[PDB]
């Protein structure tokens, strides 16, 4: 499993001169039942954006295993695919938590705060929580479960560093 990084431009042709309306980068990461995409668009003639994407074969909130699960995987932002995701979900207690470590920018290595495991509008198991650095809230994260045994998790997080919000992709698998 590798993170694929891409550069891209969207161009139009006007008077026989290709013109770039926007440019950017995106990283994609595939596991067995899920995929995540971060994406950064710049308008090359409200300026830059963070678009994320998340999808796969969602786990049904009414079909979760008993007990507890441990997950391990990757965290990635723009240039940085080195992050490491750790996460635990207690299914009996409808609760999850975890952390991000080893992104080159220290302030992106955030706790994924304890958060409730609930059902989304399609009755899929999901977790929405805060990101933390120290004891200060710094953003939110959105985690969905994937696979019929909830083998996988994937989603994304957001961190405010200075006055710029960063956006991190996160995906993991159960240890065995």
């Amino acid at each position, epitope marked *: 499993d590798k993170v694929s990084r891409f550069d891209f431009i969207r161009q139009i042709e006007v008077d026989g001169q290709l013109i770039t309306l926007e440019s950017g980068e995106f990283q994609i990461y595939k596991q067995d039942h899920s995929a995540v995409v971060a994406l950064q668009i710049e308008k090359i003639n409200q300026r830059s954006f963070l678009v994320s994407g998340l999808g796969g074969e969602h786990t049904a*909130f*009414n079909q*979760l295993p*008993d007990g*507890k699960a441990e997950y391990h995987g990757k965290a990635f932002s723009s240039d940085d695919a080195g992050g490491k995701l750790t996460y*635990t979900i*207690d299914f*009996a*207690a*409808k*609760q999850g*938590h975890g952390k991000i470590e080893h992104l080159k920018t220290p302030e992106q290595n955030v706790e994924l*705060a*304890a*958060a*409730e*495991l*609930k*059902a989304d509008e399609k009755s899929h198991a999901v977790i929405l*929580g*805060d990101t933390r650095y120290g*004891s200060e809230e710094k953003g939110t994260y959105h985690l969905a479960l994937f696979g019929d045994r909830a083998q996988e998790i994937a989603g994304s997080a957001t961190v405010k560093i200075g006055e710029k919000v960063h956006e991190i992709g996160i995906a993991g698998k159960q240890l065995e």
Partner: antibody
Amino acid sequence: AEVQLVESGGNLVQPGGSLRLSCAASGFTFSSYSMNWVRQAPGKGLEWVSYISSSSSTIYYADSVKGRFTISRDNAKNSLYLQMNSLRAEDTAVYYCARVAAGLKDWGQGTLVTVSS
Amino acid sequence: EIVLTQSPGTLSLSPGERATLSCRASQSISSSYLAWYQQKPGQAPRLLIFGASSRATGIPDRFSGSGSGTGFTLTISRLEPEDFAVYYCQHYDSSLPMTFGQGTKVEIKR
């Protein structure tokens, strides 16, 4: 489509008697959540009573009631129950039904049990 | 076994002031499984903090929790009047019978 819990069954019973509490749940897929009984004697703190998991594979009882009470649930009728026997005076309390959801997030209003001759 | 001891018994503070409540565990516990509840006369308990430091749905931001190991803390930054109540901590690890602390009362000092 909000969550609700409604205990019933509370009542007067003589010491050594027996009483069966009920809890009707709506607003969520009852068969997906662990539930608890918690009780409060008059003017006293909360005392956790018993726990049971979604599927009934895991049950706990407080030291104070281990023996005399039995928890169970019927997912078809979206109901939780608490069978009490050998009731003593110290079991006089309000009995709450509660849903485990990143903590005890949803509580019914309670049913009052009095145990007295 | 796990016993939860709260302190102090009564906290007397004026509105606006900062309130700091303590929950001590007899053994080390996972921070995942310490919760705080609020209770007012005639009402069912209400979940304030779950997972040691996460606020329950719809819970104002002035309630924060912290701690680890055997020592946990519930902080109310500015005490509104609807905040004077009884507060309980609870261990709810799903692999163990649960337990409540004996609770603390934050009364209005005048």
